[PDB]
């Protein structure tokens, strides 16, 4: 299987960054995490999100399959009540749906059930999430912003493959944590690059030399950017499989 390579239309066109900024405003900002929820909690999510991420990491899915599943799941869990038991059926349906959209070889029902509820109950749960959201499943993922933000930042084009791999990875683990769920996709992403550029010492400027321009680019204050970096790096650091 061959991979999508640079496309000026899709990554260097300045109105792609613009339109991302826009459709970012089509996912209404969550008041608080899982407000509509009486039983399960944020604690129950960091876990399930952790399994889900692993399930996405272990089966080598495209980097943008886990952000979408997290997005779907939260959204579904505004418009429906879920138990502490079903909570795993649910998150396994989200990966089922999210894979079908953002990845060429989907997770199957077998792989999702053989390791976890029946092959029918899960399908019916794909249904339930499909209805509840009225099939409006896609979304703007923190991942969608990496390359347009790299172009915007005049980062030398040939550093993109490594930075994409590093940062998309740092991003996806953060997304497991609660306090990252409130931040806006563009910002979560900006943190990703900075958290990463800092670490790897990639032949860029040092990361603080991208703060005043990421401010400009995303239209936030040079303080919101710093906090979003810190928050993200921290959420990365908070990753623990022994939580399972």
């Amino acid at each position: 299987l061959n991979r999508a390579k640079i496309d000026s239309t899709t990554m260097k066109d300045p109105r792609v960054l613009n339109n991302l900024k826009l459709r970012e405003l089509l996912l209404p900002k969550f008041t608080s995490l899982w407000e509509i929820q009486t039983e399960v909690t944020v604690d129950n999510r960091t876990i399930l999100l952790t399994w889900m991420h692993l399930l996405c990491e272990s089966f080598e899915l495209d980097k943008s399959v886990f952000p979408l599943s997290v997005s779907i799941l939260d959204r579904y869990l505004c418009k429906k009540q879920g138990t502490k038991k079903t909570l795993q059926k649910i998150g396994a349906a989200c990966v089922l749906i999210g894979s079908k959209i953002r990845t060429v070889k989907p997770m199957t029902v077998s792989k999702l059930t053989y390791l976890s509820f029946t092959n029918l109950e899960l399908i019916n749960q794909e249904k339930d999430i499909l209805e509840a959201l009225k099939w409006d499943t896609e979304a703007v993922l923190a991942t969608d912003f990496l390359i347009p933000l790299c172009n915007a930042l005049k980062i030398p084009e040939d550093l993109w493959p490594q930075l994409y791999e590093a940062a998309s990875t740092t991003i996806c683990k953060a997304l497991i944590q609660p306090n990252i769920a409130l931040l806006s996709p563009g910002l979560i992403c900006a943190g990703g690059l900075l958290t990463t550029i800092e670490t790897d010492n990639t032949n860029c400027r040092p990361w603080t030399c991208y703060l005043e321009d990421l401010s400009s680019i995303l239209n936030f204050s040079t303080n919101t950017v710093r906090t979003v970096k810190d928050q993200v790096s921290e959420a990365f650091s908070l990753y623990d499989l022994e939580i399972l």
């Binding site: 061959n2 066109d13 943008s64 079908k100 060429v104 209805e131 390359i147």
Partner: protein
């Protein structure tokens, strides 16, 4: 339901109005990968209300029903019955515009519609373009995996055939093929295999030099369309024009 308009795509009326709608009763791993993709994109972009992309109205569920806006006819029926000498001069310039417009739309939202064919392209009574069937369509992130099977044989861009990785220029290929078919009311390239098809093509565009590798009036066109059509069928896909760059090209400046 009344009379099928697609191989399964129906045609019926509604309890609200007896207005015209298209029904797509999709026969159901859970829900088919493709329809989930199709709908997901259409609802993602719908509030932008672009002139050139069919609207979707509902879904419901064993069997599944997918409900759209109705269009007079597909460009296939159009070209197959438009009074001689076929589509007029400027109607042609015009639909090329709307096509490249609804496709400048799409790509700017990081979407690729890789199933561009006159079977799929729609034409309202007022002569407006409505792009349809978004089964093979999806958001292009970077370093993402790809199947090796998009577009019906005749409209498939080279590099796809060459089993290379594709992108947006896949859309522009079919465009500068539908650009072609429009003038000469019959498919420009009619192969039988991935290799025949790459031949029918390669014995026209000619032999791409060592750098581009991984008469045209010959086949009634303006001097200007014939730079556009060459721009949309330049072998190298990093050389193929972009729908944005094309919308601005000189063939278009005289227009409604």
């Amino acid at each position: 339901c009344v009379a099928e308009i697609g191989e399964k795509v129906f045609k019926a009326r509604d309890l609200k109005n007896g207005r015209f709608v298209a029904l797509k009763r999709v026969r159901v791993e859970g829900m088919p990968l493709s329809t989930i993709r199709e709908v997901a994109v259409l609802r993602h972009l719908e509030t932008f209300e672009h002139p050139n992309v069919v609207r979707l109205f509902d879904v419901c569920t064993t069997k599944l029903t997918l409900v759209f806006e109705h269009v007079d006819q597909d460009l296939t029926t159009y070209l197959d019955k438009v009074p001689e000498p076929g589509v007029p001069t400027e109607t042609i310039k015009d639909m090329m515009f709307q096509l490249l417009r609804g496709l400048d739309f799409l790509h700017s939202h990081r979407v690729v519609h890789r199933d561009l064919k006159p079977q799929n392209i729609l034409v309202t009574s007022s002569g407006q373009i409505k792009l349809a069937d978004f089964g093979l369509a999806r958001i292009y992130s970077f370093q993402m995996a790809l199947t090796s099977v998009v577009v019906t044989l005749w409209y498939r861009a080279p590099e796809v055939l060459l089993q290379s990785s594709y992108a947006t220029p896949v859309d522009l290929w079919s465009v500068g093929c539908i650009f072609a078919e429009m003038f000469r009311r019959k498919p420009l390239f009619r192969g039988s295999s991935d290799v025949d098809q790459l031949g029918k093509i390669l014995d026209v565009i000619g032999l791409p030099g060592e750098e581009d590798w991984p008469p045209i009036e010959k086949f009634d066109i303006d001097e200007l369309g014939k730079d556009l059509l060459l721009k949309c069928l330049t072998f190298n896909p990093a050389k193929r024009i972009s729908a944005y760059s094309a919308l601005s090209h000189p063939y278009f400046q005289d227009l409604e």
